[PDB]
Amino acid sequence: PEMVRGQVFDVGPRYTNLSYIGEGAYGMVCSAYDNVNKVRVAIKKISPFEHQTYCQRTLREIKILLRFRHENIIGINDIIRAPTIEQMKDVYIVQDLMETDLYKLLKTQHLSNDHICYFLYQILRGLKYIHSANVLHRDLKPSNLLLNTTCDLKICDFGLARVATRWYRAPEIMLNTKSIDIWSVGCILAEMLSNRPIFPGKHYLDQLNHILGILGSPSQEDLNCIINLKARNYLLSLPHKNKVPWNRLFPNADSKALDLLDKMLTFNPHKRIEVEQALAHPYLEQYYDPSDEPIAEAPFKFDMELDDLPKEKLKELIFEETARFQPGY
Ligand SMILES: O=c1cc(N2CCc3n[nH]c(-c4ccncc4)c3C2)ccn1Cc1ccccc1
Ligand code: NI
């Protein structure tokens, strides 16, 4: 078995010629050659069994990604884990290999207005499907937006996905709602326009300050909803902040792109634009095609209350969910 950065990757004999992609808290992504399909694939190693929260994420992503089928959403082609539950410490999720991600692309490339428009369309087409299944992604960021050589976009990382970095987090998450994904897509749109994050806060306080520095001081109506007391008081203790017009921050940006940006980056989630209205925005006219925008057959529903389940039980559910990919099923 191969070793990638002192981490073992037990995916052989089928998957070999491993190469590092990235890593998180309890997982590592590599690329490898599939000796059956004769292509390179992406493999995601997960070690979640010590924590209940990590077990919940793993099971949700596996369940959601195996039911969904849409061009702009990553699937699961294969899953590797030990023959027995006692020996299963890791789960390897095999997925389509893409050329890069938006995080990497925005670090080296300046995007044309037509490419910002096209990438934005595919995010919203993907999210149109997700939201139609009554699911929120809850963690849309440039690293979760995969791109291939022909500019096809796929949304990955459904660990935080639920049935309806802090830089892409909606203010209502920071002040205690498919609207949270729209906020993230708004942040991503702004980063595509300038190659830098619009709200790069070092901490939540710095995050809220970055937000108010552009949007201006929140209105009474915006501070009317259920809000955390510490957060509400903090905002009430701040000196007035003026709203910075969108053309001052993005002088070169397409005004239609700035109209949609404004509607997505709305403090009040109840006043924020929805996915379908965003797809119909004049800015996405050249790509908008409701004939070619699939929705889910029925809303996604989990059979069990996963949050209440002990980590040992979640492991069993994971073992059963992953059984269909084992030889002799
Ligand atoms: O869940 C996923 C799946 C991911 N990928 C799998 C599919 C794919 N195809 N092409 C690529 C790619 C190709 C070239 N450059 C970058 C990416 C991926 C990346 C990536 C991130 N995360 C979040 C994560 C990672 C580790 C632990 C926990 C969470
Ligand atoms: Ni292209």
From 29, 93, 104, 105, mutation site for ligand 1 pocket: most ligand atoms within 8 A of C-beta: 29
The residue nearest atom 9 of ligand 1, judged by CA position, is: 97
Q: How far apart are CA 69 and CA 73, in angstroms?
A: 7
Q: Does the active-site annotation cover 139?
A: yes
- Find the angle CA(93)-CA(99)-CA(105) to the nearest 5 degrees: 115
Q: How was this structure determined?
A: X-ray
- Find the angle CA(322)-CA(319)-CA(59) to the nearest 5 degrees: 75
Q: If you count them, how many residues does the chain have?
A: 329
Residue 163 annotated as binding site: no
Question: What single string gives the DSSP state of each residue in 242-287?
Answer: ----HHHHSSSS-HHHHHHHHHHS-SSTTTSPPHHHHHTSGGGTTT
- Ligand 1 pocket list (CB less than 6 A): 21-24, 27, 29, 42, 44, 74, 95-98, 100-101, 146, 156-157
User: Are the beta carbons of 307 and 317 closer than 8 angstroms?
Assistant: no
Q: How far apart are CA 269 and CA 69, in angstroms?
A: 28
User: Are the beta carbons of 256 and 282 closer than 8 angstroms?
Assistant: yes
Catalytic residue, chosen from 139, 157, 181, 222, is: 139
User: Which domains are present in the chain?
Assistant: 1-97+308-329 (3.30.200.20), 98-307 (1.10.510.10)
The residue nearest atom 15 of ligand 1, judged by CA position, is: 100
Q: Dump strand ranges (E) for 121-273.
A: 135-136, 145-147, 153-155, 162-163
Amino acid at 258: L
